[PDB]
Amino acid sequence: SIEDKNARVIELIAAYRNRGHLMADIDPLRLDNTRTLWDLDREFKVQRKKLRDILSVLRDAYCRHVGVEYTHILEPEQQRWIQERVETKHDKPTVAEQKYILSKLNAAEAFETFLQTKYVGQKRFSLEGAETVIPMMDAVIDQCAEHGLDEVVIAMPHRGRLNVLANIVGKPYSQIFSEFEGNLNPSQAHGSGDVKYHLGATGTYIQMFGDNDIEVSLTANPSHLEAVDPVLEGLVRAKQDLLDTGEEGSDNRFSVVPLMLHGDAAFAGQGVVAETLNLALLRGYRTGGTIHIVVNNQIGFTTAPTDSRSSEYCTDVAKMIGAPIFHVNGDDPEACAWVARLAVDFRQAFKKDVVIDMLCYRRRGHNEGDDPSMTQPYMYDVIDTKRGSRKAYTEALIGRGDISMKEAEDALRDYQGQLERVFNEVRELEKHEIEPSESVEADQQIKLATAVDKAMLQRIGDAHLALPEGFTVHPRVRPVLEKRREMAYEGRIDWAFAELLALGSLIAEGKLVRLSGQDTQRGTFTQRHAVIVDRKTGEEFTPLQLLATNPDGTPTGGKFLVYNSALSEFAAVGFEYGYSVGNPDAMVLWEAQFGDFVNGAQSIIDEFISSGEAKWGQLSDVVLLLPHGHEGQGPDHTSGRIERFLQLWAEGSMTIAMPSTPANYFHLLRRHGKDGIQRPLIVFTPKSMLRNKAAVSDIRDFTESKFRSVLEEPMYTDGEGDRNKVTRLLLTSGKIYYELAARKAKENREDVAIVRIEQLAPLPRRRLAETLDRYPNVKEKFWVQEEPANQGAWPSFGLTLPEILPDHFTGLKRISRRAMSAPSSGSSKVHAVEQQEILDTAFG
Amino acid sequence: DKNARVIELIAAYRNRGHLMADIDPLRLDWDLDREFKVGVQRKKLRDILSVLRDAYCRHVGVEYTHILEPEQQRWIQERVETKHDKPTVAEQKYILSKLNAAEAFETFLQTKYVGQKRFSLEGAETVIPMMDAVIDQCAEHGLDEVVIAMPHRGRLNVLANIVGKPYSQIFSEFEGNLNPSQAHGSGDVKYHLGATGTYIQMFGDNDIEVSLTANPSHLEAVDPVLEGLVRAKQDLLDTGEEGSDNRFSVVPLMLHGDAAFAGQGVVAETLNLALLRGYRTGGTIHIVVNNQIGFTTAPTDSRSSEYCTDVAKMIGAPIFHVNGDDPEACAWVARLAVDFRQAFKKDVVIDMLCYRRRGHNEGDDPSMTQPYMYDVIDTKRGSRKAYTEALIGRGDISMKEAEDALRDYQGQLERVFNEVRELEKHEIEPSESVEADQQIPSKLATAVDKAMLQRIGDAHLALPEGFTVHPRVRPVLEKRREMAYEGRIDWAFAELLALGSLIAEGKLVRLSGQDTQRGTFTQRHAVIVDRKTGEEFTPLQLLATNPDGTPTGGKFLVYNSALSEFAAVGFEYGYSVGNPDAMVLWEAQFGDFVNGAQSIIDEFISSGEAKWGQLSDVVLLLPHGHEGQGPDHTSGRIERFLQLWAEGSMTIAMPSTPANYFHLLRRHGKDGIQRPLIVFTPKSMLRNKAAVSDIRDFTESKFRSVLEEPMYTDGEGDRNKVTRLLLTSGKIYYELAARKAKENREDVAIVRIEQLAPLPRRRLAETLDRYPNVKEKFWVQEEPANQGAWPSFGLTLPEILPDHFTGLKRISRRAMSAPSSGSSKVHAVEQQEILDTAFG
């Protein structure tokens, strides 16, 4: 029947669109083997088309060298856009464009073979077998320049990293040969440094055929595969906010493009990939779509794909955000460049991620000193019989008569001869002396005033009541706004308001403030209310945003960007780190729900925050707010692991603090934002102490004071206390101070003094010695803490204080909870009995 | 013309009907009589459309056309596109009894403990008849056990109403009156605890075991732990991948919250293991309690996709979005999910759309941030009341019957609550260390015989008929037979001697990690590959058969892991929990990457025994050493594991000889103690010709926590000439010994601490007592001053042994932000400075 045949043609059209990719000739190695007739000339309704013409369009679009996955996309306009661009007769590239593609393949393979000759076996993680990644990346960048965009920022692992640096970003060949030689000048040898395949670079890309230029950057990274992914996103988002493009901009161009490269085993196996993809369309994190390239060489070291993933493709995780996926044959450079341009066009049209799965192979072992035939003999027997993409592409151009055999040979020896001359120039250089690496501490140094005036406090207070017309405030939120106006004019300022006084005053001075984390708009402890929601309409009001406008109506240049994060730690912390790298003038704070969950971001803390300056010269001013304290809420609601951050600390790389007063926290944040130093800040913040009526500050503590790294009891600095009566000195940090002070007051213990160390790192050596010198009759000193003996500040202070200050801390003893495997007990009642034991020992 | 329109409409409902399904309980957002061709049969358009609307546009949103396997798409199509038989009155009354228990348990706790956190299931009650349907369907298939992992939402409710944890025990937790067994160790919060029981079918004649594992607050961190736990139980039952049958008769039932399922990367890493040979469990049943909120955060700020379950499309799992206010549809989808899992041994996901009746926690006000959502929730009758009215309307039950059944359950709880309230109050004491809970009673022999060494050596050459060995692999096999009979045994062979001898004794040995079959440093060759055919040979598997041909009962399970740390370490931890008699080792490619599994180390490995009474014997092998390969190829962060150490929770070692590593592994496998082992293993030292052991070190010795130089124990060295004592651990010993030999420094001695934790206090004192003329002592290490063993040893050695270590000084690299320098040449100059200071 006629109605019967038309319906089966509709099923065939759907079959090619949905599953044609399973039959596309995408694998250059062809490792897998398993991978009527009278109706062809009859016409069918689609316009009317002959079945033969319908099928040829479908086979060409879906079953040649490109496997298209797009029918999983829920937006019909996105499916239609792809359908219309892939189901057409494509215009062949010009001879000039083909010669340009060959010039890039030439550079890619000849760079690798040169290094094989000069530095045999030495680790370089060659791109050989995946040379088409260079004309593919060139096509991405050129298409971004065609759209008139501002910058392309790249993040990538080790595979062909040295090739991308030299042949895409423009890192001088001489500098790459200087790393191989191990002859580093003083600039190159600064800090502790990192391996050659982890370094970054920047340059200007000039269009070969077009009239535009675009900036190209490549960020630094650790060995930890995919860990840089959220860092790239944050870095790009900060550059977009600065250019007033994208989400927090005036134009929707998102004119800074993330280009993210991956390896096949890492893309499927590392969870941070899913966490980063999850940020792609979020208001607080979107970058208008990332261009992903997977260098799918169908191996991970010695591991076969069947042991690396539980899905058909290494890119199947990208289906979580409905991204289109293009699987392309790495031996077809024209198809590779075409997919790269289509991906940029899709990203520009829908501001969403696009994934390119480039199927290729690894010419050599995992690293150039490894033999891959021991574990993959069949794969390497096939690779051995293979002509590279450069030679195959050259033969195609010679066959078409576009270039001659002599021209191709000449261009090869010209590039080889070029490398030899740069190689010999570098070899002639006088050898720099090799010295032990030195601390970066002195590279960045801090009179900085952080006090504000009464008018500033009052303005921030009044902003909380300058509600939009007809705004219905929630009845339990209204007292917070009214109490803040009261605190601003009368004092008794609590921690939550002191934080907003610091951020609000920075905004009024013209600073961009970005604050985020889990339920951070309201605050986990219902304390912040950075955003308030209309009880009747759901409309939002952000009081601190009013501080971005001067009293005369002019802008300050400042802004308040406050968001609820996704439920992530690894990607969220990575993003905020990257954001502060991308905009050093921004105040960037990430808040943990509880300090106990920041161990989910351990790779970012270890590999970027604590060590990036010494390793790469990369600076970040990110703040981590870690709610911390022994309150009887259990082992996962007690500790931000102070001891781990103090262990990681070295070379003045981070500032670590546990403030005990609202005003000292205010001055800490203002010093951090205004010091001109780009170094992370770790703050152990309160929970119950937010509502401790003793933990409040006077107006003069904000207007006539500064950050105090060491604090004495107010009875000695302002009261009638006698320091000479003190025979026992208790040294502590954080909320336990208020419990020790309450016990001293109850028992009138004039023989005991409590000294707080507000800044845990760097140790305030001079301030501590000066403070202790004011108590001449001290006979015994104790470090008092809530935390178990193997936790808190004792593991580092117990070793460092008697060493740095021998005349003050020889014989320093510890008062704490016993050493524990978990950060606390799970029972509130057990916590309470242990807490009272510390207080009784301290005054016993 | 019209037939092609119908085929497009059929495809449209199958592909996208889920976008129009009535799944959200809150609701926040002429040709009909003609026949068409669709076994191939003709059907009226009205019937085609009816079947499609019922299957895809009612209370169930089906996502399955993304599945690449056509037989899986057909299977779902044939079961959803049919006229379903309505549940029986008895089954409906049973569903109502489950909703009654779920809601009345929550409202009871509200009345008695109004100011206490319980993370109520209210607004998601259908989770209980849904989980009951999963477990009952598993019992219908005659399976052995259902193992549950879940977060905080309705946890206390699941424990009481699904697993059978006594109400009296849950009420005693709320009362804060814990008896000595309940108060053991440091413990954890009530909504993190586990339980076990036997589920008896209501209508069928089978029973099935049901367990619920413990977890930390870290949402989704338990996911790989559940998988490993189930895989170990399957291997023991001889079911699944390493079993005689393919029933995979132990089922993982994994619950999640909507914001955590989309946001936590460990979800993707765990899903990635689902069909892997070394990790598959024959499919996990996933339930997302999708209450469309994450604390105060709206879904639009939690994910970048339409559904919270879209990550499960990475493995082509079918996804069923179901209306939480339709308990019959919820139970039906639960049974279909179990049937799919049994048919295809692949994961199934149920996205149960529901709401959170109260605030995030019962003390939080959600109307400050979600006023519109809570104005809608306030006008809603719960699922229990709505289901009751449906059954009364149909005339199956009376108003009085429903009222009586609810009063009885309430009255039942009151009586248990008052009984618990009458109990005498236990004294509250500070928590105590778990160290003494596990101790070896007597001396444990780990030495073997020459026959055992030779047997393992010969196994490397007992190649299958016609096997072509790679030419660079053949010398490894030959050198091992040589080492077995003549000595000079290297580290790589000593490891296989330990595992092979355990297999010969009947032990299950599971070893895995990144490129672990061959070994990162081309040193292991646990699996060898035929140069001509690709066929694999595993020499240690021959040790699972005695010389007489009988089985030993032992087995060698060796795998290349996925490129994961978090899920792989979580899995091996769970595997070791699931089978305490197994030897379970996870190997880091380089110790530097284990920080990717920090949540597992912090929340499970180092603390699970003290927190939950949960024991694991997992081994972590962390390649470590300063060799000039950079900050991410140098350190397994010794200092972090030593900081985490307390209460004898873990054994931490850095052996310097192959024989001592052999004895360490054998002691660990045979001691009967279930406590993790952290080993800092070598890289260059694998091929150090000085770092070899004699046959007698394996056959006539034991593990030594402290090692002296052989010149004093076996040679002509004079301990009395020593005035400087160097204490160290690991490979730096060989560099210090070489410098001493070169300069004939009889005034200097080098003592190795092989076992870093627990500190070998007695052996250290006994050893140092044999050097009476020592005037100065130094702790010497490669690692920067804020790293290695110094941060803990510098503080603990002068305290535990004051007469030996008062005035102990450090020789190391300066304190550093990264674990080393990035330059090989800079590493070398720093390495020589340590050696020059030590002998200066």
Ligand SMILES: CC1=C(CCOP(=O)(O)OP(=O)(O)O)S[C@H]([C@](O)(CCC(=O)O)P(=O)(O)O)N1Cc1cnc(C)nc1N
């Ligand atoms: C397991 C592993 C590699 C295999 C990658 O496979 P694929 O993703 O398919 O990429 P490709 O190599 O096929 O292009 S390269 C890398 C290693 O670290 C090298 C890379 C680096 O250090 O920068 P190595 O020194 O252990 O080999 N390595 C160790 C490793 C483990 N775990 C993490 C999180 N990061 C890592 N770098």
Ligand SMILES: CC1=C(CCOP(=O)(O)OP(=O)(O)O)S[C@H]([C@](O)(CCC(=O)O)P(=O)(O)O)N1Cc1cnc(C)nc1N
């Ligand atoms: C952010 C967060 C929660 C929101 C969960 O949302 P969803 O996944 O949609 O679940 P549901 O609550 O809607 O069912 S509950 C949990 C917390 O820790 C409670 C749970 C627990 O501690 O076991 P809290 O004490 O901070 O509230 N919390 C903190 C948290 C942060 N990061 C991780 C990895 N784990 C966590 N437990």
Ligand SMILES: [Ca+2]
């Ligand atoms: Ca700063």
Ligand SMILES: [Ca+2]
């Ligand atoms: Ca053991």
Ligand SMILES: [Mg+2]
């Ligand atoms: Mg690869």
Ligand SMILES: [Mg+2]
């Ligand atoms: Mg939720």
